[PDB]
Amino acid sequence: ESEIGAQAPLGFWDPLGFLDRADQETFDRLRYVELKHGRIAQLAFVGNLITRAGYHLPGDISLGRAFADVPNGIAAINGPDAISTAALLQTLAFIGFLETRVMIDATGESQFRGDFRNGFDFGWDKQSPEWQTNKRAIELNQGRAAMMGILGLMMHEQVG
Amino acid sequence: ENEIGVLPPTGFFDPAGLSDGISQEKFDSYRLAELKHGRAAMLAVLGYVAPETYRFGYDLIPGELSTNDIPNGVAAIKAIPFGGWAQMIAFVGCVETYGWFTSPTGVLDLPDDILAKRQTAELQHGRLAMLAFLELIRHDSQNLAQPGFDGLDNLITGLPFLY
Numbered sequence: 001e002s003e004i005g006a007q008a009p010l011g012f013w014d015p016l017g018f019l020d021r022a023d024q025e026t027f028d029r030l031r032y033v034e035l036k037h038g039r040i041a042q043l044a045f046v047g048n049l050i051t052r053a054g055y056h057l058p059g060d061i062s063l064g065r066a067f068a069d070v071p072n073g074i075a076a077i078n079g080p081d082a083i084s085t086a087a088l089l090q091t092l093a094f095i096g097f098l099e100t101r102v103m104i105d106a107t108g109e110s111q112f113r114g115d116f117r118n119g120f121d122f123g124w125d126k127q128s129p130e131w132q133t134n135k136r137a138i139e140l141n142q143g144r145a146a147m148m149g150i151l152g153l154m155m156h157e158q159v160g
Numbered sequence: 161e162n163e164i165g166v167l168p169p170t171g172f173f174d175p176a177g178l179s180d181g182i183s184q185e186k187f188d189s190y191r192l193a194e195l196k197h198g199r200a201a202m203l204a205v206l207g208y209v210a211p212e213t214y215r216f217g218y219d220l221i222p223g224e225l226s227t228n229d230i231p232n233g234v235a236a237i238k239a240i241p242f243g244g245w246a247q248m249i250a251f252v253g254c255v256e257t258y259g260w261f262t263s264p265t266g267v268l269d270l271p272d273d274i275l276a277k278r279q280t281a282e283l284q285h286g287r288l289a290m291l292a293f294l295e296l297i298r299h300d301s302q303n304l305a306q307p308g309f310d311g312l313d314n315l316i317t318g319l320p321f322l323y
């Protein structure tokens with residue numbers, strides 16, 4: 001089992017013997033989970049850093065509370081002086097609906113578990129020979145470094 | 161056109177023709193959605209009455225926030241923090257997506273006619289519970305927005321022996 005994911009210095013990095021028995025479906029689901037975790041980690045990086053910078057959208061979220069009035073960090077969602085639970089629940093429901101009605105495979109692009117073409121693409125037809133492998137390695141490495149950095153940021157703001 | 165869930169109180173009840181032609185898959189999805197909304201409504205109706213007389217003494221937020229103090233009805237969503245709602249939604253999603261905390265011994269081995277009648281009764285009870293939940297929510301919201309409006313006092317206007 002040597003595929004995209006052991007790029008850079010060390011090779012098969014399985015100190016715990018995770019893939020001692022192994023199987024194809026377990027392989028695919030683990031890769032999909034790692035990819036999703038990394039993607040959400042880097043998007044949360046963008047959001048957290050751009051909020052710590054000082055930028056804020058105009059307008060109000062609740063009945064008389066602007067986007068720049070909420071605290072920054074963990075206190076936004078939980079703790080005193082947080083966003084109204086109705087608004088947060090509504091946003092969570094909207095995100096769930098978008099996830100369940102947008103990023104599913106309704107055509108049959110298949111290939112890798114995580115591709116949601118459904119006909120729409122920019123240039124993922126002309127390039128073929130080897131850009132796919134190193135691109136996937138790039139996205140995986142970025143996701144892993146993301147997850148590490150975002151866990152560090154969350155713990156730092158918790159202990160800060 | 162003709163499947164489970166057609167009983168004589170009326171008979172077809174499709175005035176606006178929401179189905180018309182459709183297909184087998186779309187009809188099956190609609191039936192699944194109706195069964196799901198119905199079961200959820202029945203659970204909601206059952207759970208809207210129990211806390212009025214019984215209360216589990218657990219401290220949602222250890223140290224404070226003890227069930228024994230949170231309001232009942234549509235006012236609990238404001239008192240309960242976002243973390244608990246997220247945790248329970250994730251838990252029910254784990255129940256639904258996976259087979260976790262689910263047992264196939266509840267499918268039973270009933271004959272065909274018994275199964276059909278039981279399914280029809282399930283759908284009827286659920287259809288009733290939907291409107292039950294609607295009325296409960298409307299009364300609670302109207303009373304909370306303006307106390308004294310709709311002068312019938314207390315939650316659950318029926319079952320007056322609770323108070």
Ligand code: CLA
Binds near residue numbers: 037094096250253
């Ligand atoms: C209404 C909202 C909604 C809905 C319906 C879904 C629906 C789904 N999500 Mg999802 N998600 C949402 C919002 C939503 N999401 C939000 C807002 C986020 C954050 C951005 C995520 C992040 C997310 C990830 C990362 C993953 C999903 C996955 C899934 C799928 C399976 C979920 C599952 O098995 O249950 C949940 C089952 C579990 C076992 C939960 C795991 C919880 C982990 C193990 C613990 C995490 C640590 C904890 C949060 C903090 C600990 C604190 C410390 C003090 C201990 C399903 C389609 C999974 C998927 O696509 O599967 C292929 C997946 O990997 N979601």
Ligand code: CLA
Binds near residue numbers: 207210215230
């Ligand atoms: C729509 C459904 C629904 C919702 C949203 C809520 C929401 C809430 N309930 Mg509640 N409840 C429900 C149904 C529901 N309940 C039902 C059906 C009952 C009767 C058993 C109760 C009895 C009840 C009590 C006694 C208390 C609450 C409380 C609460 C609040 C705190 C959260 C909590 O502990 O939940 C608890 C939610 C449940 C216990 C419902 C679980 C129902 C699942 C489906 C059972 C699954 C099967 C079970 C594990 C056994 C399996 C065996 C097999 C044969 C099936 C919260 C607002 C507490 C509070 O302070 O309220 C003010 C409290 O003390 N509820």
Ligand code: CLA
Binds near residue numbers: 242243251
């Ligand atoms: C060993 C497992 C474990 C552990 C360590 C915890 C730990 C905790 N739970 Mg908890 N819980 C568990 C299992 C566990 N839970 C299970 C199995 C259930 C049944 C569903 C619940 C139901 C539950 C409720 C109903 C509540 C808690 C709350 C809490 C927190 C107590 C107050 C606090 O610290 O506020 C600090 C809280 C935070 C810093 C915010 C934490 C946000 C959570 C961890 C994110 C969860 C994300 C979700 C799992 C996955 C993503 C969303 C999904 C849709 C994809 C604490 C973090 C309370 C709480 O969160 O109050 C605030 C609360 O009301 N729990």
Ligand SMILES: CC(=O)O[C@H]1CC(C)(C)C(=C=C/C(C)=C/C=C/C(C)=C/C=C/C=C(C)/C=C/C=C(\C)C(=O)C[C@@]23O[C@]2(C)C[C@@H](O)CC3(C)C)[C@](C)(O)C1
Binds near residue numbers: 203263291
């Ligand atoms: C084998 C195993 O392991 O488990 C098995 C066990 C078993 C039993 C075999 C199985 C099953 C089937 C199940 C789960 C059956 C349960 C069915 C259930 C519990 C169905 C509730 C109906 C509630 C209704 C109709 C409420 C109407 C409420 C109405 C009409 C109201 O008017 C409400 C009301 O509020 C108003 C609006 C005004 C108020 O002022 C007055 C009141 C309060 C009255 C499973 C699934 O196979 C699993």
Ligand SMILES: CCCCCCCCCCCCO[C@H]1O[C@H](CO)[C@@H](O[C@H]2O[C@H](CO)[C@@H](O)[C@H](O)[C@H]2O)[C@H](O)[C@H]1O
Binds near residue numbers: 216218219226
């Ligand atoms: C979602 C499914 C809900 C089903 C949950 C299972 C219910 C069965 C047991 C729940 C009873 C919980 O309440 C039980 O434990 C509580 C733990 O806070 C304890 O409650 C008591 O102790 C707490 C912690 O020491 C203190 O806040 C108080 O002294 C008091 O609330 C009691 O021992 C008992 O009231």
